[PDB]
Structure formats: C-alpha cells, structure tokens
Amino acid sequence: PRSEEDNELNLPNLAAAYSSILSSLGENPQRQGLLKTPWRAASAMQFFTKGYQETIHDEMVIVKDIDMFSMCEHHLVPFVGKVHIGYVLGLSKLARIVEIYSRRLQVQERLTKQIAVAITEALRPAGVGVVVEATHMCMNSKTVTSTMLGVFREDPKTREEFLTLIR
Amino acid sequence: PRSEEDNELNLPNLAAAYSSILSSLGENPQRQGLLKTPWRAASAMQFFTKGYQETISDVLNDAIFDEDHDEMVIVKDIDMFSMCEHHLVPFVGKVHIGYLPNKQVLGLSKLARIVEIYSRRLQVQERLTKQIAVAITEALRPAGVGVVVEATHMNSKTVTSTMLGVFREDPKTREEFLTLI
Amino acid sequence: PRSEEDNELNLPNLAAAYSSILSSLGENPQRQGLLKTPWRAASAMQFFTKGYQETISDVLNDAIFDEDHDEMVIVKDIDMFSMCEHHLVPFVGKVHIGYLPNKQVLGLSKLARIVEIYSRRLQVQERLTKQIAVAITEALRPAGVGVVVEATHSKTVTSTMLGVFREDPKTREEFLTLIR
Amino acid sequence: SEEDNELNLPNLAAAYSSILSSLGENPQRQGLLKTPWRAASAMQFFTKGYQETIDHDEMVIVKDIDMFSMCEHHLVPFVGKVHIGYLPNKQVLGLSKLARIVEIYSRRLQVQERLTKQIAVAITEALRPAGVGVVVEATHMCMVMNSKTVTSTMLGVFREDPKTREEFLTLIR
Amino acid sequence: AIFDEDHDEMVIVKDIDMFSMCEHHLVPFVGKVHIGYLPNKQVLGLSKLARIVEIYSRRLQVQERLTKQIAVAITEALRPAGVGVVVEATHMCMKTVTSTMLGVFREDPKTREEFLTLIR
Amino acid sequence: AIFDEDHDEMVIVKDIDMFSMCEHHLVPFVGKVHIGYLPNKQVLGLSKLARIVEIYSRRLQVQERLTKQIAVAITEALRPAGVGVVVEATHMCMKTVTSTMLGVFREDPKTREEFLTLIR
Amino acid sequence: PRSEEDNELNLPNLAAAYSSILSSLGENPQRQGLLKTPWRAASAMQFFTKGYQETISDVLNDAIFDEDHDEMVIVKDIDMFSMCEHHLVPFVGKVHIGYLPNKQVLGLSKLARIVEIYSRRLQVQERLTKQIAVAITEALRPAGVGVVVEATHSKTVTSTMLGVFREDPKTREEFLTLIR
Amino acid sequence: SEEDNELNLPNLAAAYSSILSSLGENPQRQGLLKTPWRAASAMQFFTKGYQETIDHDEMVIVKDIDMFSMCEHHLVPFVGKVHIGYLPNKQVLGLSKLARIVEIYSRRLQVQERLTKQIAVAITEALRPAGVGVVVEATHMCMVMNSKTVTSTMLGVFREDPKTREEFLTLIR
Amino acid sequence: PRSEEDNELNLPNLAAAYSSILSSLGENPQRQGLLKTPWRAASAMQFFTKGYQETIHDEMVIVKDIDMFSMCEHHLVPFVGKVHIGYVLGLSKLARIVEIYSRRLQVQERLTKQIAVAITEALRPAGVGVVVEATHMCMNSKTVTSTMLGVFREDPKTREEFLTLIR
Amino acid sequence: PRSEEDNELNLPNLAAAYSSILSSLGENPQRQGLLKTPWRAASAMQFFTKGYQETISDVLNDAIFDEDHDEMVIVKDIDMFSMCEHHLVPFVGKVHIGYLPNKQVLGLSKLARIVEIYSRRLQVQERLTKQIAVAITEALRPAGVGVVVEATHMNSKTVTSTMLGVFREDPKTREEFLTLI
Ligand SMILES: NC1=NC(=O)C2=NC(=O)SC2=N1
Ligand SMILES: NC1=NC(=O)C2=NC(=O)SC2=N1
Ligand SMILES: NC1=NC(=O)C2=NC(=O)SC2=N1
Ligand SMILES: NC1=NC(=O)C2=NC(=O)SC2=N1
Ligand SMILES: [Zn+2]
Ligand SMILES: [Zn+2]
Ligand SMILES: [Zn+2]
Ligand SMILES: [Zn+2]
Ligand SMILES: [Zn+2]
Ligand SMILES: [Zn+2]
Ligand SMILES: [Zn+2]
Ligand SMILES: [Zn+2]
Ligand SMILES: [Zn+2]
Ligand SMILES: [Zn+2]
C-alpha cells in the first residue's frame, strides 16, 4: 500500500510533472489561474487514486444507485456512474468497498469484479451480484458491466430477480 | 496559435510527464493496461486543448451573411467539453446562444466553431461564457447577445450567463430567450 | 400492546428526555422555536411508533373474504414510513405486495393496516419486509407471498418470496415485472 | 467545542435510553443495545454546524446542492436542495466554500426560512457581490403527504432588479 | 358480435378505461382493463368487447371478481384457445393489479409472457 | 402555530394532497393544494398549514369554496401581506384548477406571477 | 331539435345511403363483415351528431350557482370528439375552458354538457371554439371567458378570448400558463 | 379502375347528400354545399387500395410506420402504427416498396387482424425470407375511450424460433 | 422558375457530377451498390430543391408540429424539424407554402421569413407568426428562429399567446 | 487507405463537381450564401467518408487486454453518423454493442473507433451492422457478439441486428442483451 508519507514525498514530484504538462500544452504556467495548478492537479490525482493505500436472514438485499467515480487507466480521464449490489453489511463499509476499488486507475470490468469479490470475502454470503453502469469521458454512451458470484451466478432465478429489481 | 509541428514536438514531453505521474502514483507503468497510457493520456490532453491551435479571426473567415433579419436567433443544447484550469480535470455541459441581429447573421457551423475554439482550452466556466458572448458581439455587432452555459464539474450543475445589449436592457427579450432554451 | 393510557403516562417522560437532548446539543430550550419542542418531538416519536399499540390479530378481524381465487393479486406503491432502530431517524419508502390466493382474499384496507402495524415501529428494513410477508401468509394461507420494500434511509431494496414465489421462476418473474 | 461534544455524548445516550423505555421497547434486545450511542452520535452529527464558523460580468449559479437539516419544532429531518445565484464584484465563490456554507447552517435545529436567509447573508458577507439569490426546496418529515416547501431570499440586484430576479428563478428550473 | 377471420394469433385490446364501485365501502375505484385472446379462427368486434367491460364494471364489485367475469364472458362468447384479462385500478379507499388467465394463457408460459409484455 | 422570524419573503408549500367530497353528486374529488404567503415578519408552522387544508377538505364541498376557505384561514391566522391558494383536482363525476389570491398576491402582478411559476 | 322519433325514422334512410356507398366503393355488401355495416355506420353517424337533439337552454337548466366568485376557474383537458363538416370524417381533441365569474359559477358536469352539445355536430374547429365560449358567456355573464381547443383532424389549436381575457394581458397569460 | 372511380364519384356524392338531409342538417348552407363531393373524394381516397397490386445474416426492422385505415364495421377510421421485421434470404425490402405494401392494404375497409396478415403475406411473397413479423397497434374510433388494439402475424422463423420472435418484439418497443 | 424540361435536361448533368464525387471520395463507382448512385443522388437533390419551380372569424388559429425538411445552402446537408404557424386557410396549401420554401437551398432565418410573408400575402390577415425549430446536420443542438408580422409583431399580448400555445 | 495527400488532391475535384451541381439545380453560385459552398460541401463529404482513411488493423493496434473476464460487456447509445450509399444523403442513429469475452476484452475507445471506421463511409445499415460485429469477433474471438443499430434515414426508425455465437444460440444471453440496451 502507498502510505501517507509516500503521498507527501510524491506530491512535489507530481506537481513538477503537471508543471511540465502546462508548458508542453502551450500554456503560460505563470498566469494567475495556472500558478497553483501543478499542486491542485497533483492533489486531485492523489485523491482519485487513494484506494491504493486502503484496505478493510432469508431475503435478497440490494443497494442500488450508489454513485461511483473512477479513472480510466488507458487515458487518465474519469469515468462516472452507478454501482448496483445484491447479496449482512450496511450502506457504510459497502460504500467503503466501492471507494477502495473505484479510487484507482481502472477498467470497468475489473472494478466490477473486485467489488463482487470484496463483498464475497467480507460477508461470505450465498451469493453476490454487482452491476456497474458508467459514462466514460475517454470516448453520451453508457457502458454496463456485471459480475455474479455464488447463487447469483449458479441460480438463474436469483440472477433474474436481481437484474429486474434495478429500475 | 499552436501548430501541428508544436503538437508532434510536445507529444514525447507530455508522454514523459505522464510516465512520471504513473510512477509517482504508486503504479507499475509496465503492466499491460498502462504500457501505452503515457501516449494515450498525452493525445487526450492535446485533444482537450486543441482550441489553442485555432484563431478567432480564422474561425470568422466567411462566417457573416447579410440576411435582412432582425429577430431572435437561438442555438440551444450545443454540447461542450472543456478542461478545468485549476486541477486539469474535464468539465462537460451545454451552451445555449441567442442573438438579435442587425441584419447580419452568423453561419451555424461557425457558431459551433466559436464554442469549440474557447471550450477546448484550460478554462473557468465564467470566462468561457464571456468569450463566446464577446466573440459573437465582435463578429456580428448585433442589438444583443445572450450566452448560457450549464455544466457538471458534491452533485450539482453550474450555470453561468452573459447577457449583452437588448438581452441585458429589455426584460421581454431576456425572458423570451430564457424560456425558449 | 401499548394502550392510550401508556401514551399519556409516557408523554412527560419523553418530553423530559427531549428537553435534556436540547440542552446537551448546546441549544437554549427557552427560545420561541424550541419552547414546545419537548412535547412536539415526544408526540412525533409516539406517532412514528404507534404500531406497538396494535396486534396482528385485531387487524385480521373481518379481513378475510371467500373468493374463488383470482390468481395473482398485487397491491403496489404502498407508501411506507418507518423508524431506523439503529439511530432513531426515519426511513421512507414503498411496499409492493403480491399473493396467490387459496380461495381466500384479503381486504385492501386490511393489507394497508398490515404495512402500518409493522412500519410504525423501530425497525430494520429486512425485518419489516419479512413481517409483512409472514403476516399475509398467516392470515390467508396462500400458495405464495411476495413482498418487495424499496426505501431511502440511492435506495435499499429488500424482498421476501415465500412458497410459490421462491420455487417457481415464472410466478416470481411475473410478480417482479408487474410491480414496474 | 469538541470537549463539549465528548462530555455531552453520554448525556445524550442516557436521554435516548430513556426514550427507548418510554416508547414501550426493551433497550436490552440486541438491535437496541447500542442505539442510545448511535442515536446520540447521529444527533451530534446533525447539529455539528453550531461548532463551525466562516473583473466579472455574469450571473453565476450553483443549483441542485443536496441539503439535509433538522426541524427545530419536531426534531425530525427535512431534506431537499439549495439553489444559489450571485452577480460577482471581482470575487467568485469557490465550490468547496459554498458547500461548507450550506453545511454550517443546515447542520443545526432549523426552520427552512432561517436556513435560507443565513446562506444568502453568508455569501453576501464572503463575496460582497452586486446581489445574491438563494432558493431552498425541501420535504419536511413533520408533515406525516409529499409536499415541498419552497423558500427564497433575494439580496442586492436580485431583490432590486426584476430582470435579474426572474433570470435566476428561470435558470434554476 | 362474432366474425370469422382466418386468424389464430393473439389479439389484444389494452388501456380500456374502467369505472367501478367498491362494494366493501361504497367508494369508486377507477382504472384500466387489458384484454388478450387467442382466437379459434373467430374474433370479437371491438365495440362488443367494450360492452362486456361495461356490463360488469358498472356494478357494486370487488376487482378480483370483475377481472374473472370479463375473462369468463369472452371465453363463453368466442370459445378461443385462451383469454387473459389484467385490471389495474386506483381504489378511492386508499395501484391494485389483478389478472385472470384462461386456456393457453394459463397453460403456455410463452403465451402469458407475450401478453404481459405487450400490455406495457 | 405562529412563529416570529425576521422574514418578509415568499413562503410556499406546494403539492399538499387533498381529498374532498363533491356536494352536488356525493362523489369524491381528489387533488393537490398549493399555498403561498408573504409574511409580516411571522410564519405559520408547516403541520398547522396541513391541518387548515384538512379541516376544510374533509367536508361536503365545491372546489371554489374550499380554495377560498383555506386562503381566508391563512389570512386570518397570520395577517400577512398576501396569500395565494391554488387547488388542482380530478372530479370523480368526470383537471379543475381554482385559485384565490389575496393582498399583494391579488394586487402585485410580479408577486402572483412568481407564485404561479414556483408551483410548477 | 332532433327528437328520438326523428332518429328512428331517419335510420333506414341513412342505412340505405350507406348500402349505396358500399356498392359505389367496389365492395360486396353481402360479405359477412359488411352485412350489418349500413345500420352500424348509420348509428355511428347519428351518435357523432347527437348534439342536434339538444338545445343550449335545456342544459342551462339547474346549471348556475351563486358563489361569491372564486376568481379564475379552469377546467382543462376535456376530451372532445367532433365531425369535420367538410368531409364527414372525425376529428378528436381537447378543450381547455376558463372563466372569471361575476358571483355566478357553472356546474362542472354542465360545462362538459356544453362541450358535448356543440362537439357532437358537423363542425369546423374555429366555430366549435366560439360556440363553447359564447354559451358560457350567455349562461354566466362573466368578466371574461377563454376557450382553447387543440385537435388532430401535427395539431390545430384555436382560441377564443372574450372580454377580460382579450383586453388584459395578465389574465390571458395566467390562463394560458395554467392550462399546461 | 380509374374509369370506375369517375363513374361512381357522383353516386357517392348523391348518397352523402342523402346522409346530410337524414341527419337533420341543411345541405344548402355554405359550409355543407360542397360536402357531398368532398366526402365522396375522401371515401374514394381511403379505399384506393382496392385498385392497387404488387447474402444476409441479420434481422431488419422498420418500426413506427404511420398507418391509417377504415373500420369495415362502422366506416369510421382506425389510426396507428405498423412494425415490420424480417430475416432476409439474399433480398432486402426497399423502403418505398414497404410503404406501398402498407398503403395497398390499409386503404380499404378493414379489420385490423386481416390488415396485419396481408402485410406479412405480401412481404413473404416479395422477399421469400427466412421469416416475417408484423405488429399493428391502432386506436379505433368505433369505440366512442383511448384503448389501443395490438395485433400480430408471425411467419417462418418468426413463428418457429422463440428467440427470433422475442427479439423482434423487444426491438419494436 | 425551373420547368420540368429543365429538370430532365439537368438530370444527366447532375448524375455526371455525382459520378465524379464517387471517384474523388476514393470509392469504386462500378461496385453494385454504387452503380445507380449517380442517378439516385441526382433525383434526390432535384426533389430536395423542387420548390424553385413551384408558386401558389375572431380567433387565433395555430397549426403546430408541421414536419419540415430543408437543405443547408452552406454545406448541402439536410436540416430537419418543425414549423409552427399562427394567424382563413386550411392545412392543405399551408403545407404547400411550407414545402415551396423548404424544398430549396436555405438558411433557417430566411425560410422562416418567407413562410410568414407567404401567409401574409395569401390571406392578408391582421397578423402572422412563424416559429421554426430544427436540427442541422451541418453541425443534437436545436436552432429556433421566429418571424412576426402584423399584430403578431405589434401587439405583445398576441405575440405572447402564440408563443405559449406551442407545448 | 485514403491518405491526407489524397484528400488535398481530391478537394478541388469535389468542389468543382459541387459548383456544377449548384448550376444544374438552377442556383446562382455567385450569391453570398453559395460562394464558398463548393469547398464547404466538399469538406463535409470528405468528413462523412473519413473512415476510408483508416484500417481495421491500425485501429486494433494495442486494443486487446487480458482481463480474466468472461461476463457480458455492453456499450450502449454510441452515436453513429453515416452516408447512404444509394443517394449520398446522411443517416444518423445509435449503435448498441454487447460481447461475452473469452478472458480478453476490447478497450472502450477502440470499440468507438471500430464504429467510426465503418460508419464514416458510403454504407447500407445492414452492412455497417455486420462489419462492426465481424470486427469485434475477429479481434477478441469471444463466446458471442451482439450489435444493434437503430437509425433515421415517411417517418420511422430502421433497426438492424447481428447476433453471433452465444448471442444467437443461447436465448437467455440474447434476452439479457436486448433488455439491457
Ligand atoms: N428473495 C429471495 N430470492 C432468492 O433468489 C432467494 N434464494 C434463497 O435461498 S432466499 C431468497 N430470497
Ligand atoms: N447574466 C446577467 N444577468 C444580470 O441580470 C446581470 N446584471 C448585471 O449587472 S451583469 C448581468 N449578467
Ligand atoms: N439478429 C438475428 N436474429 C435472429 O434470430 C437470427 N436468426 C438467423 O438465422 S440470423 C439472425 N439474426
Ligand atoms: N385569441 C385571440 N388573440 C388575440 O390576440 C386576438 N386579437 C384580436 O383582435 S381577436 C384575438 N383572439
Ligand atoms: Zn479511456
Ligand atoms: Zn472543477
Ligand atoms: Zn439508516
Ligand atoms: Zn416541521
Ligand atoms: Zn374499499
Ligand atoms: Zn359533481
Ligand atoms: Zn380535416
Ligand atoms: Zn370497429
Ligand atoms: Zn451548414
Ligand atoms: Zn436512405
């Protein structure tokens, strides 16, 4: 994991790289609006990737419309959307699981699988289903991905009920 | 302006800086998903800032037409994609333009190029709004201009608006534009 | 059950605790806007928990009717207001109910009374969902019961499928599609 | 202060335990065991605002800001949206600062009309602009059925110029 | 009311306005009826289908009974392979959805799934 | 029910559910009430405003009378600069929209225009 | 007015003309689907023109009520079905009515009867619009009447603004916005 | 033929004049003077279809085709939409040809079920494809309240393969 | 006006120009799908420009949602939308007025004015108002233009009522 | 492929043909609104056909990633603009893509480039649909591919669909894709 001291050590290094980008784009890094941009861009990129340092009944429970912000690892442009989860844990820590994996350089299919595997390893339930619907700024087209584990993968009725209960 | 010679020259400089950023973030730039990221991120940033390559004078070449029109012309829901100048993160939205011509009108494709020239740069929404309004005013010299930008940068939309001429002075003109958009 | 005698007896006890809370939060309980807050907050809490006053069997009085089973019966978009037992903060939502009768139907207003008895209590959404389903099952004894509760504490959706609604993919699918 | 919060937390928990008994519940059942403390922390969180403090030619609007507050009459939440608009004089409101202003006043025992005025006065004192407009639309859980309460405070050119006022109200739709 | 067509495929008449009285409390309940049938080469005139809905809806009723009566009336009039009737209504003593599936609409899952999707 | 706030700006409570009986035919009429007022430094508690709507709506009524009664009740309780009440309802013997504007809501065109736009 | 005696007398006359039309179109009037068409078409035409049977004054019977004028009264989205007098083909639409009473209101069902009397006739949309407005004006004698008819014969929208609704920009604007 | 149309036009006008008198109207009033001829031309136009005649691996669908027809029971129009789908065998239906097929059958005294089958059979005979599907959704003015009648005809793989049938019905939504 | 014989004479000339375009684009005009394209493109362009040969109560009458297809004169790409008219003439001939001006190489502002002037010259009414809302393929942004003549330009109440009655 | 050298060489040829068309239609090519139309029409036609300049092999460079994923991936509502090959008139719509990967996935921007390469040409909707499906199949070799194109060319939408592999064979797979789009 990347500790807090790693973040403080790499912050001036990230700012130096963003200063370089401002010059390479044709901008004047000395103009008032850009003066603090190398540090602000560095802090933003550290915040969007803070998940690297992080670590942790007879009814279907679903938490839908959870807002999600991730970064596309191919172009370093954000992708934003919603996560729908099905499977006992509450909204808190479920949100924490989403934020640990979404706050990284990702691909939507990987992010989807990591969320379902994290819920499975935390709760050890009969099954888990995760659907992510997001808009990629690296391309208004929506990308929908899904990962089913346990009874959500094996039982078609369970799988079908979860997919209908999102609307 | 930024030429294509400048773009090819600065591409390795941008890629080298993005390689540096991947290492500083704790990532391994050799993993499959990151291998070409320095170049792809550099090309994306060049594309989001391609408005620096253009000039308002060049955009305005063969752009004005004498139509003998003096009534409100509105172009609404123009898609707009821009770069936040504070954090280098994109912001996306729409532009709604309205003007009252003094017999001269602006070609629709040229109005879209005005929005593109200023939006594809490192910007602040209020500045982008004013630049589009000032460009239309300087090109057409009309009775009035109205420009409204609504964009997503917590969850909420930012709306900015520049009202010039009869759009600032006449309540009926301003009300009509805002209701029609 | 909780009688009206209990309510009038516990009202000063609740108001005294709310007066204490206002002081502990840093507020001045003498300011105009707070003067009657101990009593208003106490009455609100009593109202949000009035389901303790009722029993399952008194609402089942004159609630069952003999009909020759009109296959699946659904009552959707039933407004629901409940209290989170973890923090004593409200949660609001909708209840969608469906059942396949065994020649016995439940009166519409009585179905709403079942939702009210359990929702007006300190709850957890999963428990509230199961209690509504079990109450319908015990009252009608039907082929199956499906209860879907969607609430805001982003939404949480819970569901209890008893009997036919658990076993048969077709009946469960038909219910879930009809509640759109 | 935070010293006050740590001191009053057991006092709040004790009062919530008293409420659990007065409602007819058994505070010893598993689901209620930690409820006095959880309810106390939640109430402290909903009232943390008591602890807190502090060349242009275009209208700037930030609409659909999520807002959550407490009805001071019944101690039941009221949830909604805040729409802010201003005409700047050399100073522009930072989005983080605007959010903190909404938070400082919403995290208190409130009346929607007061909350609306306080946000407007805070923006006026921070930016010193030509004018400010604040509209709050919220659902009150006291009324328990889905009625919205809309309040507004218009300062400066937003109160004086009808065109300015009307443009802000149309743009927040 | 009955016409001979070379037709053995599903005929649906959806969104038929319905106005009935709840017998339990003497308060009205208003909604829509969705009818579907698989004819045995003969079809029912549209205006006659509306009259069937009217005869039963204009009475003191229970939604479950009203749904069954319309379905039984169509079955007895046309003698088709199957009938499906869905009633969705708002009760003034408060949507309640009831359905009666007969013949191929009860027996064949594909047939009822198609009817239920076509009425949305 | 009345509270003193330093408030002289428009307060609106829209989409209040309303259930009333039509006196002419003894059939219900259901809808929404939209209330607006300009206070003279004092405001009305939200729950009390709902109780005013309830006292008059739960009777044998005519929509025009119900609208006026709510407006007159708010005026007499708060004594504000102006009051506006709009009722939109569906009559079961069939939307009917009625409105009563008092004080600044009747006199100032800007004030009524603002109220009518804010309730959409 | 057109009596029910007139209807039964003219039914064979209408059926005979529809039989003639079926032959002139190239059809065989003996085929199953056409056998009763002369009578069905005749009854349909009689139904679409049943407004000739009623008079303006018989629906004005027990229609006016003395109320202390609840300012503007609006009844919007009134379904309307009429017959184009140019080609004898139906046109369907909605009627939005508004009036400012002079302490005299019209019963809701009677307002619907005014729309029906004029719409169930061989019409032109502009005439139907004016007739509804003139009927309300003559029945209540109000400060003003506004009638907007939107129909499909792309939509045609016609409007008649009498008195206050013609003169005052504010009352006309308020009416047109409220009918959204 | 067109000779038949010109011959029967005065006969149709004479019958519409008779209708105008039987309804209680005055056929001499200005607005009705030309109605017999206008009604006759309209009825001829609504029935002009009596005069008229005549390597791939993907489903092709043309949805939301406007359709206007006449109820043969009451002589009142029924208006709606036609959704056509086919799985081609070397031949693709031209959009102009598809429109003419819908027109040839809709411009007659019809029953919706018959109109649906005729369009399907015409596409099958023109393209000779693996299958055809036709769905007609229409509002009948006989029912006079806004009920839609939906009819369908499935031929070939559209009747035999459930997956094909289901894909067509989902794609026309 | 461009007579029918002008159209028949210029049809092979238009086909020859479209054949030239196919070759200049990099396509093979001999492939089956392109063989008849020079003639089909010529007939389509003649149809889109057929308006060049063409020529011709106390209530507000409005005809809204009239479909409109025109050609952008700057790029020869279509622009499609709706026309809303206010002002006695029926739907027929009103549609003919729309089609005479829309079937030409146009600019939306000009098309709008020509429709209002044609209605004014045909009916001689107290006033006329024309609003055109269209999507230009030469750029989903909507362009809205309007022209008011007579009482629609002079009386604000008349103007305001017409603009509200479109929804 | 069509190079930029070809584009500059063919621009006067296209403009000359558009000048000819303006004269043949009865217009005066000297009027203000038409003066630059030969060049603007030529540039527009070049832009609508820029897919001829690209190659599927070039688009597929650094496009496949090994993600250890075997579940359905859908990209819906991809805007699509194309040229009708019969009359040279544009047609516009959307593309919905779905595939079941055999552990290998396609980069989102590369999927958009596949749609762009084939859509920016003189086309027939059925061919465009099949080409996108065949390109994905050949690049990823997945368990199945589904491509649905809905476009506006009387008033009505044309929907075409290519279902390959498990999308053709498994009813549940096909049903899931069609409901999710
Ligand atoms: N709602 C629900 N859906 C399932 O699929 C299920 N499977 C089980 O074992 S318990 C249960 N509840
Ligand atoms: N958009 C805008 N609206 C106003 O009302 C205004 N008033 C001013 O002084 S600067 C300005 N801009
Ligand atoms: N899209 C599509 N759907 C089918 O059902 C089909 N069946 C075939 O033989 S080719 C084909 N394509
Ligand atoms: N509806 C309507 N609106 C007007 O503005 C008008 N002016 C007139 O002279 S007659 C008339 N009718
Ligand atoms: Zn990317
Ligand atoms: Zn930002
Ligand atoms: Zn909670
Ligand atoms: Zn309250
Ligand atoms: Zn009842
Ligand atoms: Zn009544
Ligand atoms: Zn007509
Ligand atoms: Zn019929
Ligand atoms: Zn253009
Ligand atoms: Zn085409």
Numbering used by the authors:
A (entry chain E), I (entry chain E): 58 to 113, 126 to 156, 162 to 213, 222 to 249
B (entry chain A), J (entry chain A): 58 to 210, 221 to 248
C (entry chain D), G (entry chain D): 58 to 210, 223 to 249
D (entry chain B), H (entry chain B): 60 to 113, 125 to 214, 221 to 249
E (entry chain C), F (entry chain C): 120 to 213, 224 to 249
Text lifted from the article:
AXSP0056BS (cpd-1) was identified as an allosteric GCH1 inhibitor in an enzymatic assay with half maximal inhibitory concentration (IC50) values of 4 µM. From one cocrystallization campaign, surprisingly, we obtained two independent structures of allosterically inhibited GCH1: one fully inhibited form (xtal_GCH1_allosteric) with all allosteric sites occupied by inhibitor, and a partially inhibited form (xtal_GCH1_allosteric), in which only two of five allosteric pockets in each GCH1 pentamer were occupied with cpd-1. Cpd-1 binds to two allosteric sites of each GCH1 pentamer, which are located in the interface of chains A and B and of chains D and E. The three remaining allosteric sites per pentamer remain unoccupied. Binding of inhibitors into the allosteric site, which is flanked by two distinct protomers, trigger different process changes in the respective subunits. Interactions of residues of one subunit (chains A or D, right) trigger conformational rearrangements of the respective subunit, while the conformation of the other subunit (chains B and E, left) does not change. Binding of cpd-1 induces concomitant approximation of the C-terminal helices and β-strands of subunits A and B (D and E, respectively), while distances between helices B and D, C and D, and A and E remain unchanged relative to the active state of the enzyme. Analysis of the conformational states of all protomers show that chains A and D exhibit an inhibitory xtal_GCH1+allosteric-like state, while protomers B, C, and E are in an apo-like conformation in terms of helix bundle and β-barrel positioning and curvature. Region A is ordered in protomers A, C, and D, but is highly flexible in chains B and E. This observation agrees with the also drastically increased flexibility of region A in the remaining allosteric ligand-bound EM and X-ray structures.
